[PDB]
Amino acid sequence: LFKTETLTQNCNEILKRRRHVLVGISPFNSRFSEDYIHRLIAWAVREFQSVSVLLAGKEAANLLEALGTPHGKAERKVRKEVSRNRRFAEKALEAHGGNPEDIHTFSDFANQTAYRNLRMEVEAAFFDQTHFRNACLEMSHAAILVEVSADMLELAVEYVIAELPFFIAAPDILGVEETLLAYHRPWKLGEQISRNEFAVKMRPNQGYLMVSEA
Template sequence: MQTRSPFEMCAPSPDPASPILPSMLSVKGHSHRCERIINMKEHALIGISPFNPQFSPSYVSALLAWAESNFKKIDILIPDVESAALLLTSTGTSAQKAIRKARKELNRQRRVIEPLIDKDSPATAQLIEFSDHFENTAYKKLRKMAQNEYDEHEEFRTACDAMSDCAIASRVRATTTPSTSPLPKPRGVATENYILTEIPFYLNTPVILDVRSSTLIYHRKWPIGDQLFNNRFRIAIDRNQGHGIVSISNQKPKI
């Protein structure tokens, strides 16, 4: 079987340069169970990635407005500075410069997001960083389970490494020619401190945030998602955890 490179597996995010309206967004569940959870409309956790042109101010504004009108409660998930910096150090940026650039990028995202949070809305959102829950008992248990699976299960480790390659490839793509630029090695640090740090929210946001059910919202599937839904590993997605892939329609905004 031919192996696809991370550049092929992780297609570039669509360019959201033109204005986007909430009415142009739609969501599809990763599975039938996800569709059921989405239709419950109880809680959405919106994943926002640093250094990704998908998350333009226009797109983020439309995404939050869409989510507030479709879910009873929403929260927004971004990485902490140290985690985001790993996407840069993995491509050769010095640690000091990576921290500085990561902080600048996350501050930029905060400046976009925070004015959009309606404090008076019933769906009042919180802006959450990975590190906000490092001491959360449920989070720590899920993180340890993921770490044990990574250490002991080759298929899970390979899937996580592929996701790490995707994250690294996205950053490399922005500054180099993908076909001629090999990925930096080793990738283990980025895998362990980014993918495994985020994965508890993918497995069981309800127990971490104390909600009955939750849908993780992102603009594409997680590469590891199919294997998790098909019970290929010893860790599993909670029955109250959904995953929704948001897409932008070809509808043109009315001026």
């Protein structure tokens, strides 16, 4: 039903224990359709003890703004899109035996200590290390995905910075022992992170699970 590919041999060991998976769902991404979300979550609930859903926070508007959508309309548009992702995930979670309250957005933790610490770690790296800054900008290019300017990227990159703590430690934010972030795309930044190319480090209880249909 789904084929999986881990980041590291560590990501693989977390995978073997099947404790928690954090399923990402992106706004405005043709991948996530009601039927697809239903299948993914179905598979998650089967394969793991515990399933959580991660949605896009407020900075998702930065993406629409980079595409020239005006600021006010951008927030309203993101609100509609994300609340719609939520409704689809709630349905699926309810239907397959998961907990409908296990949906979060990456903005929900803004005042949480664990989230703020991590966001600081990422900002310090973003500003200090040029390599990291560029990896991040490449990634925000990926997110916006008719020409793309450097200012568009300085805008959209807020999205990548806000999201990243769930990629490097979700467990600290959600209070869970260990977890895998499941998503359909390859994560290039993650591959570099895993090789110790930056001051940002993936926590030993976190892993990235690339998931694809079968």
